[PDB]
RNA sequence: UGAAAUGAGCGGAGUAUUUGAGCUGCGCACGGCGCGCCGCACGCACUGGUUUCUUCUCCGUGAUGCUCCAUGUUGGCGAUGGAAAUGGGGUGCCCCCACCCGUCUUGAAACACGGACCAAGGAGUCAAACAGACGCGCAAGGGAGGAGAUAUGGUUGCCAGUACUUCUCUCGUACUGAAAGGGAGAUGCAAAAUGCAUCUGUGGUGUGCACACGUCAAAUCCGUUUGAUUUGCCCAACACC
RNA sequence: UGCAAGGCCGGAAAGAAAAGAAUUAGAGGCACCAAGUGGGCCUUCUUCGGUAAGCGGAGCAGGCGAUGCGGAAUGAACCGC
RNA sequence: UAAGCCCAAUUAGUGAUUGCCCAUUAUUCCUUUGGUAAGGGCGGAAACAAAUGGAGAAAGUGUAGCCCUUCCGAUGUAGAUGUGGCCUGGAGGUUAGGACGAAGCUUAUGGCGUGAGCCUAAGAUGGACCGGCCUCUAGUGCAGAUCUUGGUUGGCGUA
């Protein structure tokens, strides 16, 4: 395998044309750690402080013909413990 | 003194090129040695083996020898050595030799502060 | 594909592109199609006769 | 009889003024405006040379070997002191009168000399303020003669 | 010096440039010049023809002093004449005298054109040398 | 223990690695040693006369250049 | 990959720095490297190339050889034109076989004491390469010359002496040894003196 | 002030700038006229051929098309396990690397050379668009031993030093029409280095007529090369 | 993020410019019929004409910058703290890779041999003969060596060194024959079983650096310089004599 | 005055047309000093002995040996590279 | 109603000739290194103090490479060669350090170098020598020779 590129299967996306629509969209993997560490708006919004963490990326290109897409995460690769876990594909950046 | 701004340092490789199977023999130092065995997997470039150093790993010439602070380390041993760094004080930073005594280090640090010559291992209490 | 490089190598490319635009004009295309078919058919009939 | 070109060939690789440390070739030549080990910057080697040195206070001294007495070591280098507030371009012109190919480095060195004098005064004032609030066990005083 | 040798370069090369198959053994060819006619014949014949066999008469108790006879040619005679004498030397006039045996030469050979005419005291002389020196204006006087 | 007898397997590759060098051109090493003797002797006399003519021609050219 | 079989056989050994430790040699190389680069002179290019060569590849020339070749050039040379400067990248040695030589201007890396005396006494002059660059910066009116190397004992020894047509001297300290078999017809065979090529 | 030699260089440089601008404008005009002349020649030749075909058909005769003069050859195999005869021919064709592409004259001496190395190459007869795309997008000249991308007509004119070759259109015309300078133009260029064909090949080990790729594809090389250029 | 924005794209200027398409003039090519007649899809030249449709068109900034570095926007975090960041180091875990080293051998992960750990030790050395490459001195000459001499006939020592000398010795400047023994220039005139004369001279021919006369082509910032070539001399070399 | 040969003095030279009428990542030649190797093995075609052999023995050429990588699940030699 | 065999396609009688997935291959971009490398610059242009644009610019094989632009190659056993390549003991020079702590020793002490290695930090280690640079020199670099010597060690609280 080549861990710099991830493969994400998105519900209701079963054609290559469907996966083309999501090219360039933001992708987020949500998990939690053991200790509460620094997050965005740590001082501004103390209610956001949690063990919950996110790793972000973007969709680069469709994979195959059945709606699979390739995702590249910011800098680092997605952990292998995320295999089989939920990935969030947002509707922004929007071309509509 | 602020160091001269250079392009981003890439650092093609971070891990060392350690000797093959040094972790299994305590007498074997981790220092690199070219494997010359006729059946050596490392020498034969097997996929899941340790890599070997070569010319390709060489670092970019524009940022070579640059410390994370942005200076280049120039070893110094006394006060008079600092005057060599007066003009190019944004390029080089002095490194006091380990065997230089505390008595002499006090004079070296004080003179460096006046000359605005960065010391890599000087008194970090000064310069804030 | 690059505009500057193509024009630098071929200063006549603007003339060629203008000719391409005219050929792809729909009114020009239909009129040319009618004229070409008519005059080729006439030449064939006259040569046969 | 023995030119700078010949002398540079002789001493380029080995010289008491050459400081090769950690892969860096520098020079502690007192007549080197830069510290770089090049033929142009070797003030001790060149027939004519100039160097920008500090003086007591904010004054800037220019030491010139004009070539007339290179065989007289005590008469080789002559010092002329420019009073504090001298423009760095004036010091550059003074160096350029002998070595036109050292004008740019001499100007920068003249600026650096002024900056160091100002910073030394500022650092010394701060150090004295810190020292005035400390009771020192010992204080050494050189005996006057 | 030891630091310039291939041994320094070969530290860590194991076989030190002698190979894994052949290896560096003790005497794979025999010692010295052994096998000059067997298994080394080609080397001896192609590089040292004439090595084997006998030739000529024997001379017991050779004494080289009786056989001493160095030679010098006419075109080299200026080496034994001082520069001032050579300049003043002209054909038909006063000429320098060269004593060959005191100069370490026994026979005058006579190759090439003689540069400065002179009188030559020699133990031996070739016929061509004697002819040429007389034609040039010099002379040869026998000595012992 | 028997071994291989003979082969020419790699010899062509070795010969072509530095290439089969072309023959020396006919204008070089064109010695007549060992050829038919009477023609060789006659040619020698002709060549001797040619050398004498070459010497005379250069003498004439030297005088011509000196005069002009 | 790119098919480049035997591409390394195209590469040639070209040296750009001298092996010499002579500081004065290095100064001359610096001077003529600049002149070869900054001037349109074939003479400067050749002189710079020859200043890098090894001592064995800078053969010495004799004064008699210089005098002979200048005379060959002096004839067929206009009477209004001055004789060229003999330029030798190497040592110039005296010849005792030539007593009388004309007045010539000779530039060389080194002169023997006798050779320099002979040149001066003949009315000529000896020049160093810095003077040659001063007065002939492009090598105008120069006669570039090379010494002889084919008469050297090393050359005479090169090659096997036991093959037909070979006349190389063998490596033997004893002249009388190695004279019987392979060298005389009466001792087995004699190596053939000639072989057609 | 300014030194005397600095002033002299300044005067020379001003004149050099003036000459550079004027030469650039003159070259652009020359290239413009030549490109116009070539474009009309291509249009006229095509129309003449179309009319000649119609005249033959209208009376039941047949028009025999001219045998193509220029072939475009690309290498579709690696550098492993090549016999020496094929190895030398590929070297002479300058096809030393996979997907190297060259233009050759389709004469009998070259045809026999191509036939001996069919399994390693795929070749056909190029069109004007194929020639233009390769010259403009993949055109590199041999200048002082260096592979230099064609970026202006000045480097073309300086490279060839010929009145008939001063612009990229001159280079394109020479290749396409097989002019008197076909060898000079083709030899002056670095061999074309193409990307693998998007969409893939069919079967590199079989002839094109066999359903593979290594044969003569006639004009079908153009759509093969379009996915590569 | 404009630290030289070469742009059909940036800046000015003007409603023009000429590409193609239609429609057509003459000549010539082309095709069908057997001499010049008919046709001509619309090829070539007039860079033909008509502008009915389709286009934008032109001009513009050298480096007086040899090189490198240095110039946005919006939030989050960071207001000197056991702080925030980035990199490094440590340990574990995931998914994917991954047969034990050294050795002989065509072939080793091998049911082929040496292989429990660590420390210290452990293997191309010295001398002589020759050769080639490269560095240095001198050069038809180079160099000793042994030994003397005195600064030193002095000084614990530095000083077992350095400085100086050689009618010698040695390697070369000459080679050949088993030996007795002989022993090499060129040119001219002439053919004497040692022919005469002259001494600034490559023994001759072919190919051949530079340089000197010119002569063409390309490019010039118009000063030239990048090639090629004629002739002369040809250096070093190579080949015939 | 012919022939053979070695030269000298002149002439002419699409520097090699046209007819499919070559191409070249074509600097040609010349030396000097040396190392390792001189057990091989495999394969497409040709091929000898043998019932045959993962057997022995050759030819032309590729390959392994000396070399991994991507493929044939696995394989020194197969495919791709 | 293959996920078998033979043939044939690329979203399908619709309107055109690249379905998709994997290389140390190809194209291209960045970086290193070496060339039979290709070029340009190197006569400091002018002007410019601090308090409050900068720095460099070496005629050069090789260095932290004089600087910049450009092109091409880059694997490899036996083997060859090179390296202003690394390291060790000693000598001739030069320049420094040390009782305010030398050598040696210790490391989740980091930094630098493709690498051999170098350097700093800490020792709640040590107690007197020693570093850099040029040259000279040699008993100069260890993982394994059923290698030598010394110590240790699982077997084992076992037979
Ligand atoms: K073997
Ligand atoms: K480079
Ligand atoms: K250098
Ligand atoms: K080992
Ligand atoms: K135990
Ligand atoms: Mg193996
Ligand atoms: Mg310590
Ligand atoms: Mg100035
Ligand atoms: Mg090896
Ligand atoms: Mg060896
Ligand atoms: Mg052996
Ligand atoms: Mg063997
Ligand atoms: Mg007998
Ligand atoms: Mg055998
Ligand atoms: Mg001789
Ligand atoms: Mg396929
Ligand atoms: Mg195949
Ligand atoms: Mg505009
Ligand atoms: Mg910026
Ligand atoms: Mg076996
Ligand atoms: Mg083997
Ligand atoms: Mg093994
Ligand atoms: Mg087994
Ligand atoms: Mg075994
Ligand atoms: Mg055994
Ligand atoms: Mg001799
Ligand atoms: Mg032809
Ligand atoms: Mg596999
Ligand atoms: Mg469809
Ligand atoms: Mg390699
Ligand atoms: Mg020792
Ligand atoms: Mg630990
Ligand atoms: Mg030892
Ligand atoms: Mg050990
Ligand atoms: Na690293
Ligand atoms: Na197989
Ligand atoms: Na790669
Ligand atoms: Na590169």
Swiss-Prot record, chain G:
It is found in: Cytoplasm. Keywords: Cytoplasm, Ribonucleoprotein, Ribosomal protein. The keyword Electron transport does not apply. It comes from the Eukaryota. It holds the Pfam family Ribosomal_L18. GO terms for molecular function: RNA binding; structural constituent of ribosome. SUPFAM superfamilies: Ribosomal proteins L15p and L18e (SSF52080). Its main location: cytoplasm. Transmembrane segments: none annotated. Residues 156-197 are annotated as: Disordered. Residues 178-197 have a biased composition (Basic residues). One of its GO terms (cellular component) is cytosolic large ribosomal subunit. One of its GO terms (biological process) is translation. Gene3D superfamilies: 3.100.10.10. PANTHER family: 60S RIBOSOMAL PROTEIN L18 (PTHR10934), LARGE RIBOSOMAL SUBUNIT PROTEIN EL18 (PTHR10934:SF2). Belongs to the eukaryotic ribosomal protein eL18 family. This is Large ribosomal subunit protein eL18.
């Amino acid at each position: 395998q080549t861990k710099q590129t991830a493969l994400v299967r998105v519900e209701n996306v079963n054609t290559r044309e469907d996966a083309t629509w999501y090219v360039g969209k933001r992708v987020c993997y949500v998990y939690h750690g053991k200790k509460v560490k620094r997050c965005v708006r740590w001082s501004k919004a103390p209610a956001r402080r949690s063990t919950t963490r996110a790793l972000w990326g973007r969709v680069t290109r469709p994979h195959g013909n059945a709606g699979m897409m390739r995702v590249k995460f910011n800098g680092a690769s997605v952990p292998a413990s995320a295999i089989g876990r939920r990935i969030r594909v947002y509707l922004y950046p929007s071309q509509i | 003194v602020k160091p001269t701004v250079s392009k981003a340092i890439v650092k093609k490789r971070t891990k060392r090129f350690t000797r093959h199977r040094y972790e299994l023999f305590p007498q074997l130092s981790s220092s690199w040695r070219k494997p010359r065995g006729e059946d050596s997997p490392v020498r034969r470039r097997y996929k899941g083996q340790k890599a070997m150093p070569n010319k390709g790993y060489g670092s970019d010439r524009a940022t070579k020898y640059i410390t994370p602070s942005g200076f280049r380390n120039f070893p110094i041993n006394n006060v008079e050595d600092l005057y060599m760094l007066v003009m190019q004080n944004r390029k080089y930073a002095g490194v006091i030799s380990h065997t230089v005594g505390a008595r002499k280090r006090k004079a070296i640090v004080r003179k460096a502060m006046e000359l605005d010559v960065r010391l890599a291992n000087g008194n970090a209490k000064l310069r804030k | 594909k690059n505009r500057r490089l193509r024009l630098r190598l071929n200063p006549y490319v603007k003339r060629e592109t203008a000719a391409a635009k005219g050929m792809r004009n729909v009114a020009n295309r239909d009129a040319r199609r009618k004229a070409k078919l008519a005059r080729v058919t006439k030449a064939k009939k006259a040569a046969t006769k | 009889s023995h030119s700078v070109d010949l002398q540079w060939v002789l001493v380029r690789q080995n010289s008491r003024f050459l400081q090769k440390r950690g892969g860096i070739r520098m020079s502690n030549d007192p007549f080197n405006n830069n510290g770089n080990w090049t033929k142009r910057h070797c003030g001790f080697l060149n027939e004519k040379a100039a160097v920008v040195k500090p003086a007591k206070g904010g004054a800037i001294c220019v030491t010139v070997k004009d070539g007339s007495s290179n065989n007289k070591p005590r008469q080789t280098y002559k010092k002329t002191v420019h009073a504090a507030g001298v423009r760095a371009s004036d010091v550059s012109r003074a160096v350029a009168a002998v070595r036109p190919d050292l004008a740019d480095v001499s100007f920068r060195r003249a600026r650096r000399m002024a900056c160091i004098a100002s910073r030394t005064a500022k650092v010394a004032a701060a150090r004295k303020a810190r020292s005035e609030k400390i009771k020192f066990s010992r204080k050494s005083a050189r005996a006057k003669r | 010096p030891t630091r310039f040798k291939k041994c320094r370069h070969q530290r860590g090369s194991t076989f030190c440039g002698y190979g894994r198959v052949g290896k560096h053994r003790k005497h794979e060819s025999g010692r010295g010049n052994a096998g000059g006619m067997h298994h080394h014949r080609i080397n001896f014949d192609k590089y040292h023809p004439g090595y084997f066999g006998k030739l000529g008469m024997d001379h017991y108790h050779r004494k080289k002093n009786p056989m001493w006879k160095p030679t010098i040619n006419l075109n080299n005679l200026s080496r034994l004449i001082a520069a001032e004498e050579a300049a003043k030397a002209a054909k038909g006039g006063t000429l320098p005298v060269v004593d060959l045996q005191s100069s370490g030469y026994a026979k005058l050979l006579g190759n090439g054109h003689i540069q400065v005419p002179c009188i030559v005291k020699a133990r031996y002389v070739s016929k061509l040398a004697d002819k040429k020196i007389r034609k040039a204006g010099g002379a040869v006087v026998l000595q012992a | 223990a028997k071994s291989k007898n003979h082969t020419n397997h790699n010899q062509s590759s070795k010969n072509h690695r530095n290439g089969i060098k072309g023959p020396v051109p006919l204008h070089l090493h064109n010695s007549k040693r060992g050829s038919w003797l009477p023609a060789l002797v006659n040619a020698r006399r002709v060549r001797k006369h040619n050398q004498k003519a070459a010497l005379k021609k250069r003498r004439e050219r030297i005088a011509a250049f000196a005069a002009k | 990959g790119v098919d480049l079989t035997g591409i390394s056989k195209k590469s040639r050994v070209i040296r750009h720095h001298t092996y010499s430790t002579n500081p004065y040699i290095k100064l001359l190389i610096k001077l003529y490297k600049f002149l070869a680069k900054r001037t349109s002179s074939g003479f400067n290019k050749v002189v710079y190339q020859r200043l890098i060569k090894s001592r064995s590849n800078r053969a010495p020339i004799s004064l008699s050889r210089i005098a002979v070749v200048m005379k060959r050039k002096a004839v067929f040379t206009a009477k209004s034109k001055a004789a060229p400067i003999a330029v030798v990248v190497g040592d110039v040695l005296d010849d005792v076989r030539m007593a009388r030589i004309p007045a010539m201007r000779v530039c060389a890396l080194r002169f023997s004491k006798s050779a320099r005396q002979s040149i001066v006494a003949a009315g000529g002059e000896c020049l160093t390469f810095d003077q040659l660059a001063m007065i002939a910066p492009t090598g105008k009116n120069t006669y570039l010359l090379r010494g002889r190397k084919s008469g050297r004992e090393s050359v005479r020894h090169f090659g096997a002496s036991g093959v037909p047509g070979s006349h190389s001297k063998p490596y033997a300290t004893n002249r009388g040894k190695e004279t019987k078999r392979g060298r005389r017809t009466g001792r087995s065979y004699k190596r053939k003196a000639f072989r057609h090529v | 002030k300014r030194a005397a030699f600095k002033q002299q260089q300044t005067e020379s440089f001003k004149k050099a700038v003036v000459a550079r601008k004027a030469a650039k404008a003159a070259l652009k005009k020359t290239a413009y006229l030549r490109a116009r002349k070539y474009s009309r020649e291509y249009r006229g030749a095509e129309k003449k051929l179309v009319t000649l075909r119609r005249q033959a058909a209208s009376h039941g005769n047949y028009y025999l098309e001219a045998k193509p003069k220029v072939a475009v050859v690309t290498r579709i195999r690696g550098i492993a396990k090549v016999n020496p005869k094929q190895r030398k021919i590929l070297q002479l064709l300058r096809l030393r690397q996979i997907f190297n592409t060259v233009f050759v004259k389709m004469n009998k001496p070259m045809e026999n050379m191509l036939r001996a190395v069919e399994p390693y190459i795929a070749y056909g007869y190029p069109s004007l668009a194929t020639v233009r795309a390769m010259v403009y997008k993949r055109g590199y000249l041999k200048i002082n031993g260096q592979r230099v991308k064609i970026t202006d007509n000045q480097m073309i004119k300086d490279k060839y030093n010929n009145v008939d070759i001063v612009c990229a259109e001159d280079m394109v015309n020479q290749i396409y029409t097989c002019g008197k300078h076909f060898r000079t133009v083709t030899h002056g260029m670095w061999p074309f280095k193409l990307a693998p064909p998007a969409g893939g090949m069919r079967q590199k080990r079989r002839h094109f007529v066999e359903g593979g790729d290594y044969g003569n594809r006639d004009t079908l090389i153009n759509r093969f090369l379009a996915r590569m250029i």
